[PDB]
């Protein structure tokens, strides 16, 4: 009983391309990859928070971290997706 993204990966797979199946080892590879990029963005956000006197991790710290790690097209699409979701969250409480 470990907190796994597996059902969420199958859910977000079934929205855009439901015709493709998913095995077990590939799903565990996806879970390890998303946990690796999650802990990488977590330690980079904590590092940028401890840099310049801001202990609270806001959207500014993690958007600077997303702009820091990712390439230009990837950071552009990621900051677009992040701004879309933060407007959809701050609007609908």
């Amino acid at each position: 009983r470990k907190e796994t993204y597996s059902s969420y990966i199958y859910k977000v797979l079934k929205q855009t391309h439901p015709d493709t199946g998913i095995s077990q080892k590939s799903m565990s590879i996806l879970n390890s990859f998303v946990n690796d990029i999650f802990e990488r963005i977590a330690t980079e956000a904590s590092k940028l928070a401890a840099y310049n006197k801001k202990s609270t991790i806001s959207a500014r710290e993690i958007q600077t971290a997303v702009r820091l790690i990712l390439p230009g097209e990837l950071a552009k699409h990621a900051v677009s997706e992040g701004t879309r979701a933060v407007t959809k969250y701050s609007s609908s409480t």
Partner: protein, 102 residues
């Protein structure tokens, strides 16, 4: 009403905020932070699953194998910038015979 259903999110934003709180990273986490973490992880997951769906489409196999994920991660320069150092288990290598031997 969970925090995921307040923005149509699927990745566990409350669980992610919990792992940021009790995870030896920082002290405070703002309310606008883990929804944005859920957003960028959802974008990366959607990108890699769409690449895996294309790799399953053009290789006439209806399932996702680690070779398809390896050809997804290694045939893109943005993915070679992001994860050009890690490997995929049973993913194989890039078929590319060099021009001097040909």
């Amino acid at each position: 009403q969970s925090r995921s259903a307040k923005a149509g999110l699927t990745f566990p934003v409350g669980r992610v905020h919990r792992l940021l709180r009790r995870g030896n990273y920082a002290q405070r986490i703002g309310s606008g932070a883990p929804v944005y973490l859920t957003a960028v992880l959802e974008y990366l997951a959607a990108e890699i699953l769409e690449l895996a769906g294309n790799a399953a489409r053009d290789n006439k196999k209806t399932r996702i194998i680690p070779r398809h994920l390896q050809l997804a991660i290694r045939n893109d320069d943005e993915l070679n910038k992001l994860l050009g150092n890690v490997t995929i288990a049973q993913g194989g290598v890039l078929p590319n015979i060099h021009q001097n031997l040909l």
